[model samples]
Target: GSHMGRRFLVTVRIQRAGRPLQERVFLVKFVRSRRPRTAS
Candidate 1:
């Protein structure tokens, strides 16, 4: 049996169309569970 874990950083950028405005940036941390195990 094997187990693994990982960490990731997520970012989103938004801008107005036809505008020279500074882009808005958002940052977040995301995690996912893959093949979780249970004790029997």
Candidate 2:
């Protein structure tokens, strides 16, 4: 019924045993389905 293609940014820092590392980072991106999926 409503718009279903919206998305946002997400960031995650790497971590060692005790603290966050300064070498690598991660990102996330996802969106909801605009149409219903059919059975495969």
Candidate 3:
């Protein structure tokens, strides 16, 4: 039913017009972003 908080689908279009010219589809997953141990 619902993929509630895990995975997602996104589409990026590089379009000539408002229509579908070229589509890049991405499957998104839930990954955590960690901070570095040493700061820059």
lDDT of each: 0.35, 0.37, 0.37
Candidate 1 residue lDDT tens string, 1-40:
3535222222222234435643422222222333557999
For every model shown, what is its TM-score relative to the native structure? 0.16, 0.16, 0.14
Candidates, ranked, lDDT: 2, 3, 1
Per-residue accuracy of model 3 over 1-40 as CA lDDT, tens digit each: 7656434322222233446633332112222443457767
In the order shown, what is each candidate's alpha-carbon RMSD? Answer: 12.3, 11.6, 11.5
Q: Candidate 1, which segments miss by more than 4 Å at Cα?
A: 1-33
Candidate 2 vs 3: which has more TM-score = 2
Highest-scoring model, lDDT:
2
After superposition, candidate 3 runs with Cα above 4 Å error: 1-7, 10-18, 24-40
lDDT of 2 by residue, 1-40 (tens): 5755443222222233345553343222223324457898
